[PDB]
RNA sequence: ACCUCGGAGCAGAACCCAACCUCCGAGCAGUACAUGCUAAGACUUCACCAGUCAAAGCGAACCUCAAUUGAUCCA
RNA sequence: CCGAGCCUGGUGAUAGCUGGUUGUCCAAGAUAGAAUCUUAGUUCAACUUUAAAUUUGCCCACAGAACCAAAUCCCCUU
RNA sequence: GAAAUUGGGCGCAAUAGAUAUAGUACCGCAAGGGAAAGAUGAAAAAACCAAGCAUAAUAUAGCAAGGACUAACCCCUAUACCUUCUGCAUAAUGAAUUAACUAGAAAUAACUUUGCAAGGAGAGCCAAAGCUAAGACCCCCGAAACCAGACGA
């Protein structure tokens, strides 16, 4: 054996330090550990697409929960906060509902005033002057 | 369904919702506008002849001159002698 | 072929290449056409004149015969009255 | 066998062969070994020019 | 078999009803298209995967100015199901070399040549 | 030349300073790893 | 909700053009302006080569129309300078 | 039963295109005896091997047929 | 353990057949065919890869491609 | 496949290196096959690290994890790996696991980098920019057999 491997101990511990919190022999035996440490790393990067998915689904379920307290549905709140050019995203709107429920009651009041201004413009077809909260601000 | 639901003689039936009908319709209205704006060209085919031939010919000449300028890079004495610096010490 | 001989340790050449082909020093191999003396009575005189011709080989056929022969058959040969003397050099290529 | 400033030679060859080509020739000096590698065949045209310089 | 499709010239002869729906002029038509790809080149034949590379529409939702000439329009007629064609309207004129660095292409298809971010 | 003037400031050429010409020695292509060998070419 | 923004002339994405994603995100507290964002330098450079393409392609048409407007006159006096002698 | 070559259909319009797919055939015969020699440029049975066509020129004169076939070995 | 003992040697028999072929990271990358005691294989082409040289490549318009359908070929502009 | 002719270690260090502590023990009637392994210190007249367990059995749910989380689990997401294939979670192959051992060896031609240059090369050889030198590409296990010579009724 001219040169055989003298540092094979440290190549095993590169993998086995990630497996210390496993079950069974996956935390000890190297042959069983690499098929799970690799699989624990692929799931770690495929769940960067699911954290952003499961946070937005959580924010939608926390805006839908709080908009129902004021009688609004979720598409009646997001759809009419856009129309008032109030570009708040789902993270803040779900964190306004928990920590500032007076401001969230004002955003539910505003998104329902614009909704009623959208119906009153739609039942009165033909040229009518616009609503007060329905006037867009133009940028040039 | 006897074998492989979506292929073969007996497949499971798939049906068209209001989603799939409205998705094809709003793609059919982008298409009808596409046929409108392609129906009125600015030039006829005889006016456009050679109207950008001087720019197309100079475009190829700069690809052709980049292709026939492939050559090794210059080799400096200050790249060969800088490897002497690996044994640069203090005193 | 024999890449390493057991007596010397060199390449041998396929001697069936030598009795069939002629290498010019430019790199071309020159061969006679197959069947040029077979059944000449049933051939038209145009077809008989095509067979009585030395024709060149392909690119891959020339690279296969170059591997089949050693470097002795790839040298300058300054013969006295070589009829293929004018064909060894290559004039006027633009690659 | 170029000794001295090979970069001055490379400019003088770029000023000599560019009328002979139209385009400036693409070269490569090898400042370690002291050569100059011009793309194309200018064997007789650079031998006659390096003789007029007295080398 | 599945071949390429010759679309007849009748399809690209606009009706006078069509000039009222979309705001185009038959006399004095527009000069520059704004081409934007809105469908993938996957599951499309190779003669449409290469036309999209010829027009520069390799990215979706990226606009591209192309001339309104019958040779560019012959390439847009091949891949019209993949793209969205709109006219580049110019309210102010084409930008000078002083107004070159302050332009913006809007979603209406117009190219404003003075782009502040201040309200009116 | 001027390159012999550059050698004065530079430390001495020893057997720990030498390096081949970049382009001479090619790396060996031996079949260990993911790419260079699984069925090994 | 971006089919409403396309009717007002805004970008369908609020992260497109407009005051939100083109103004500077910050400034120094004393009031000196920040160095511009790398995404604003990349967008303004991509908007310039678009506007350079509008200027280039429009002039290639207008110069290409005048060339045909001269070649159809040079065809015309060729018809009249042979009708003599 | 078949194995090579050719004509037609599938394969409707440049080429190509399978099948123990559908139908026909071929392994010759006849007439010349310059059915002599040479040589530009090409075609090509999806490679190669073979197969095709050919102006000019020399020399004289004043091939038909779809297939009609078989490499190398030096005697 | 006998359709021809067992052991050693030739012997590292031969296998178009199965199995195996060990550091890291990046890049390009898939399906016309022909011959073959050949169809579990190989050689050539085709495709692919690298390096090099050059000048066109792809998309295409009029016109054009035979007598007994969808399209293609060819093709300047662009 | 000729001839004339020419003239101590960029080794191994107890699965390595010899089979070898030994052709011994053991196996076969015989020819024949053929092992394993030891480690104190100047003097014996003087810890820490594999698998496996124990310390310390287990709590609904599911490739044994990941995103997480105040929190181990509960929630959400996720059909082991290798090989072979048109295609394998596949109820196709292989694998209990640990330690050690176990598999790409080279030619002309090209390419890259130097030297010198109509010549190169420390005879031989090549040369219509060549020539000399270097660098860089070619695996492992497995038959039933065949033959020669012994040894066996
Ligand atoms: Mg089924
Ligand atoms: Mg593996
Ligand atoms: Mg061919
Ligand atoms: Mg004639
Ligand atoms: Mg073997
Ligand atoms: Mg890739
Ligand atoms: Mg086989
Ligand atoms: Mg063309
Ligand atoms: Mg001798
Ligand atoms: Mg031993
Ligand atoms: Mg342990
Ligand atoms: Mg679960
Ligand atoms: Mg599956
Ligand atoms: Mg299994
Ligand atoms: Mg198997
Ligand atoms: Mg098993
Ligand atoms: Mg007895």
Swiss-Prot record, chain A:
The gene is MRPL20. PANTHER family: 39S RIBOSOMAL PROTEIN L20 (PTHR10986). Keywords: Mitochondrion, Ribonucleoprotein, Ribosomal protein, Transit peptide. One of its GO terms (biological process) is mitochondrial translation. Its main location: mitochondrion. It comes from Homo sapiens (Human). One of its GO terms (cellular component) is mitochondrial large ribosomal subunit. CDD domains: Ribosomal_L20. GO terms for molecular function: RNA binding; rRNA binding; structural constituent of ribosome. Belongs to the bacterial ribosomal protein bL20 family. It is found in: Mitochondrion. This is Large ribosomal subunit protein bL20m. Transmembrane segments: none annotated. Component of the mitochondrial large ribosomal subunit (mt-LSU). Mature mammalian 55S mitochondrial ribosomes consist of a small (28S) and a large (39S) subunit. The 28S small subunit contains a 12S ribosomal RNA (12S mt-rRNA) and 30 different proteins. The 39S large subunit contains a 16S rRNA (16S mt-rRNA), a copy of mitochondrial valine transfer RNA (mt-tRNA(Val)), which plays an integral structural role, and 52 different proteins. Interacts with OXA1L. SUPFAM superfamilies: Ribosomal protein L20.
From Swiss-Prot, chain B:
One of its GO terms (molecular function) is structural constituent of ribosome. One of its GO terms (biological process) is mitochondrial translation. GO terms for cellular component: mitochondrial inner membrane; mitochondrial large ribosomal subunit; mitochondrial ribosome; mitochondrion. Its main location: mitochondrion. Keywords: Mitochondrion, Ribonucleoprotein, Ribosomal protein. It is found in: Mitochondrion. InterPro entries: Ribosomal_mL63. Belongs to the mitochondrion-specific ribosomal protein mL63 family. Component of the mitochondrial large ribosomal subunit (mt-LSU). Mature mammalian 55S mitochondrial ribosomes consist of a small (28S) and a large (39S) subunit. The 28S small subunit contains a 12S ribosomal RNA (12S mt-rRNA) and 30 different proteins. The 39S large subunit contains a 16S rRNA (16S mt-rRNA), a copy of mitochondrial valine transfer RNA (mt-tRNA(Val)), which plays an integral structural role, and 52 different proteins. This is Large ribosomal subunit protein mL63. It comes from Homo sapiens (Human).
Curated annotation (Swiss-Prot), chain C:
GO terms for cellular component: mitochondrial inner membrane; mitochondrial large ribosomal subunit; mitochondrial ribosome; mitochondrion. Signal peptide: none annotated. The gene is MRPL35. It is found in: Mitochondrion. Component of the mitochondrial large ribosomal subunit (mt-LSU). Mature mammalian 55S mitochondrial ribosomes consist of a small (28S) and a large (39S) subunit. The 28S small subunit contains a 12S ribosomal RNA (12S mt-rRNA) and 30 different proteins. The 39S large subunit contains a 16S rRNA (16S mt-rRNA), a copy of mitochondrial valine transfer RNA (mt-tRNA(Val)), which plays an integral structural role, and 52 different proteins. GO terms for molecular function: structural constituent of ribosome. Belongs to the bacterial ribosomal protein bL35 family. This is Large ribosomal subunit protein bL35m. The chain holds residues 94 to 188 of 188 of the full protein. Keywords: Mitochondrion, Ribonucleoprotein, Ribosomal protein, Transit peptide. GO terms for biological process: mitochondrial translation; translation.
Swiss-Prot record, chain F:
Disulfide bonds: none annotated. Residues 27-41 have a biased composition (Basic residues). Belongs to the universal ribosomal protein uL15 family. Residues 13-41 are annotated as: Disordered. Component of the mitochondrial large ribosomal subunit (mt-LSU). Mature mammalian 55S mitochondrial ribosomes consist of a small (28S) and a large (39S) subunit. The 28S small subunit contains a 12S ribosomal RNA (12S mt-rRNA) and 30 different proteins. The 39S large subunit contains a 16S rRNA (16S mt-rRNA), a copy of mitochondrial valine transfer RNA (mt-tRNA(Val)), which plays an integral structural role, and 52 different proteins. It comes from Homo sapiens (Human). The gene is MRPL15. The chain holds residues 10 to 50 of 296 of the full protein. This is Large ribosomal subunit protein uL15m. It comes from the Eukaryota. It is found in: Mitochondrion.
